[PDB]
C-alpha cells in the first residue's frame, strides 16, 4: 500500500493547522501571536509569527515525501516541560485500511474538521500544563530504513536526526482518545498521552 | 555516554565497526542508521576528535571493500553527518 502526492498534501495541510491549534490551546505560545482563521469550514487559530510558521512549514515539508509512500506510522507533537521532560503528546497514528467506506477526498472537510473540533475543546479533559513548556515534533517510521532519512533530508538548513529515549519516554502516562476516522484509503487516529502528575 | 551498541570506549567502537564491515556483505539498514546516530551524538556531546577518527576509519574500510554496498553506506552516513555539522558548527568535516 501507498498513499499519493495529494493525499500526502492533504495530510500535511491538516497537520499544519493542527499543530498550530495545539500550540494555541495548550498555551505553548501566548494567544497574542495567533489570529482566527477558517480551515475545513471551522474556526482555528494560526500563528502569525514568521519564524515559528517557517519551522512548522519546514517540518511538514520534510515529512511529506514519507507520507507519500505511506512510510509513517506516527507523527507526534511532543510538549516538553521547563526541564525538558515530556509532559504531554499529541499522536497522529496513521494506518492503511484494507470496500464500503467514505471517500477521503470527497469528504475531506467533514472528516478532518472533526479532529480540529476535538483539539479545540481538549483542555476540558487534559490537566493544565506547567509554565515554560516547549514543543518538538517526532516522526515514527513504519520501518527502520535508510530511505526515510534520504527522503526527509531535503532542506539543508533544516536537518533531522534519530531521536533517543530521552526525547520519548514519559513517566506514568495516561491516554485520552480524541478522534478516530476511517476512509477510502486512510485510517487516522488522534490521541493524547499526558503525564500523571504535571 | 555516546555508545555504539554498548561500545563506549573508542577502541570497542573501532573493533566492533571493523568486524562488522569485514564480516557482513549485506548490512542491515537498521545498523547503518545506528552508526549515523552514534556519529550525531558525538556531535551533540562535543567529541569532534572521535567522529573524525570514526569517519576516517570507516571511510578506509568501507571504501576498500569490494561491495558496492559499503561504498554507498559510507556516502549515506557522511551525508547525514555533514548536514548536522553544517548546522551545529557552521562547517562540514574535511574529507580528502
Amino acid at each position: 500500500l501507498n498513499f499519493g502526492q495529494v493525499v500526502a498534501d492533504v495530510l500535511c495541510e491538516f497537520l499544519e493547522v493542527a499543530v498550530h491549534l495545539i500550540l494555541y490551546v495548550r498555551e505553548v505560545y501566548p494567544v497574542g501571536i495567533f489570529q482566527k482563521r477558517k480551515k475545513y469550514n471551522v474556526p482555528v487559530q494560526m500563528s502569525c509569527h514568521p519564524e515559528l510558521n517557517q519551522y512548522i512549514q519546514d517540518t511538514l515539508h520534510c515529512v511529506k515525501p514519507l507520507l507519500e509512500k505511506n512510510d509513517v506510522e506516527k507523527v507526534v507533537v511532543v510538549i516538553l516541560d521547563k526541564e525538558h521532560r515530556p509532559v504531554e503528546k499529541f499522536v497522529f497514528e496513521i494506518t492503511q485500511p484494507p470496500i464500503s467506506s467514505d471517500s477521503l477526498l470527497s469528504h475531506v472537510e467533514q472528516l478532518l474538521a472533526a479532529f480540529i473540533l476535538k483539539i479545540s475543546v481538549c483542555d476540558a479533559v487534559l490537566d493544565h500544563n506547567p509554565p515554560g513548556c516547549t514543543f518538538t515534533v517526532l516522526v515514527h517510521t513504519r520501518e527502520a530504513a535508510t530511505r526515510n532519512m534520504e527522503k526527509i533530508q531535503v532542506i539543508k538548513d533544516f536537518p533531522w536526526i534519530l531521536a533517543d529515549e530521552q526525547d520519548v519516554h514519559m513517566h506514568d502516562p495516561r491516554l485520552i482518545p480524541l478522534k478516530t476516522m476511517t476512509s477510502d484509503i486512510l485510517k487516522m487516529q488522534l490521541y493524547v498521552e499526558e503525564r500523571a502528575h504535571k | 555516554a555516546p555508545n555504539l551498541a554498548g561500545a563506549v570506549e573508542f577502541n570497542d567502537v573501532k573493533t566492533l565497526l571493523r568486524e562488522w564491515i569485514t564480516t557482513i556483505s549485506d548490512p542491515m539498514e537498521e545498523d547503518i542508521l545506528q552508526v549515523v546516530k552514534y556519529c550525531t551524538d558525538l556531535i551533540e556531546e562535543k567529541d569532534l576528535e572521535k567522529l573524525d577518527l570514526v569517519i576516517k576509519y570507516m571511510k578506509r574500510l568501507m571504501q576498500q571493500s569490494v561491495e558496492s554496498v559499503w561504498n554507498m553506506a559510507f556516502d549515506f552516513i557522511l551525508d547525514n553527518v555533514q548536514v548536522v555539522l553544517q548546522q551545529t558548527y557552521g562547517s562540514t568535516l574535511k574529507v580528502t
Binding site: 509569527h49 519564524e51 516547549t134 527502520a144 530504513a145 536537518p159 534519530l162 | -
Partner: peptide, 20 residues
C-alpha cells in the same frame, strides 16, 4: 530508536517570540 526521526532545530522559544 531507529525509526524515530526528529528535527535537529528547536522551534523558536517563548522568549524569542516576546519581541517580534
Amino acid at each position: 530508536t531507529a525509526n524515530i526521526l526528529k528535527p535537529l532545530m528547536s522551534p523558536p522559544s517563548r522568549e524569542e517570540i516576546m519581541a517580534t
